[PDB]
Amino acid sequence: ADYDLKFGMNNGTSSNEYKAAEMFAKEVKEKSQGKIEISLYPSSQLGDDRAMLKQLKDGSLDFTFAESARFQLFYPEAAVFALPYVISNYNVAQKALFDTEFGKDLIKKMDKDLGVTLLSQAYNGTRQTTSNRAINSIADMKGLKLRVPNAATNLAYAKYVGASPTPMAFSEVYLALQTNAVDGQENPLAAVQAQKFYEVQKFLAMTNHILNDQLYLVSNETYKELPEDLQKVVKDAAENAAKYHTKLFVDGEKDLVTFFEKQGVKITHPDLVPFKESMKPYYAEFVKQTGQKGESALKQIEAINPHH
Ligand SMILES: O=C(O)[C@]1(O)C[C@H](O)[C@@H](O)[C@H]([C@H](O)[C@H](O)CO)O1
Description:
This protein is α/β, with parallel strands linked by helices. The protein is 45% helix and 19% strand.
């Protein structure tokens, strides 16, 4: 095609993310009259999310997914998006990104500093905790060998609840759980399904600890080369895909418990009051490290009413 573009992701072919990217790719191809074809590179084929972001910066990958929180690697105050229990719901995540001074500035910096254009934002689920033993309360977390992604905020969740974190790449998690090299992981229900973690985890606990969004990103190197009518095709497609993406996750969150129970998983509902209280010193560390910019991001987010 005139533009043979590539979209990389960590998720596999059964996932919501892949389904939404498929929808995006199909719309772009049809609405561009065949001038743009987007090929998909799932399962971290091109590297992890960090690697794929760098490929957008340098222009060698055209599209990828990222979370708003992941930009904490560049702007430490952006950790606010994944401080456990701070962001209440997706309503708050949307307004945090698009409707605060902090979020608008973050979008500008992504463009200027990191060479990527934000096309759209989706909901990507609320993270829960699976394990090889029941989590009936915060006590059961003590010493749990809990896989986390390579991200400070997930490491902190594990630390502050009393668990023993093992960072590792998403692609490695299934085997780590199967071999009992680790005792559990934490991810939204959709990923528990897509990656088949339920096959190798007998327990799921509704910790509700971190709210994930997902950003449709394009490389500025690619976006600048598209004539403006094709830019609009891409943008419009990303906005339509993100709405679909959000719907997949919302519907799954109401449907997946009966799926997991049918697959033999036991679901627990630990009291979250001590989970939340355990984070208080982490918040104070965040404010100590990030100073007035973090204080300010936190105040802007905490000001957002969670009710639509
Ligand atoms: O490895 C995981 O469990 C994963 O959920 C995979 C997902 O594709 C990715 O977007 C996130 C992200 O890297 C973290 O949430 C930190 O921002 O991590």
